[PDB]
């Protein structure tokens, strides 16, 4: 089955977009390159995770 990775990716990408709205979430620990996380980073991070959610949406629609 080939909708398995698209479905997983869609779940994972929605949750990461929903968890980024919590400033104390564990989802901020993945950015190991960045020493200290200022608010001008979290802006770009939320924008990126939103874009990643919309193509997780598009890839899943093309497989469901």
């Amino acid at each position: 089955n080939r909708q398995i990775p698209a479905a997983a990716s869609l779940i994972q990408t929605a949750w990461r977009c929903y968890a980024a709205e919590n400033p104390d979430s564990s989802t901020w620990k993945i950015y190991i390159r960045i020493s200290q996380l200022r608010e001008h980073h979290r802006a770009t991070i939320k924008v990126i995770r939103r874009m990643q959610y919309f193509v997780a949406k598009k890839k899943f629609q093309q497989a469901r």
Binding site: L10, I11, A43, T44, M51, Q61
Partner: protein
Amino acid sequence: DQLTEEQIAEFKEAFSLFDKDGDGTITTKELGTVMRSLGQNPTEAELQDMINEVDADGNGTIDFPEFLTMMARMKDTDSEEEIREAFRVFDKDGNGYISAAELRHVMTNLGEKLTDEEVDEMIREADIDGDGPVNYEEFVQMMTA
């Protein structure tokens, strides 16, 4: 919903962070310069995919109006149904409940491969009735609302 408040100014700043040169358009190179600074290593194919989802016309770059359109989007139940379908792909019996071990497995080992600490926060947010299966219809609703 509601009429956009000062979040227009919050999005204008956020738009300005990608728009390094100030020409009013976000390019693939401008998006890649931001992502690599965060430690990510995306392919030019991935950049084009992200840019194409938010570009409403065809000019291949994002302006601020399309940026606002994108940042102002939980499409009623229409986007709940899709997450509900994605969960159903792993609901082997078709009952509406998935095992904690199974959910932990798919989230850690395939797709976008989330960390163990993220999956812990994930299973924790759905207060398990003891050591029982997790209902994902409650997950979809907690996420969207």
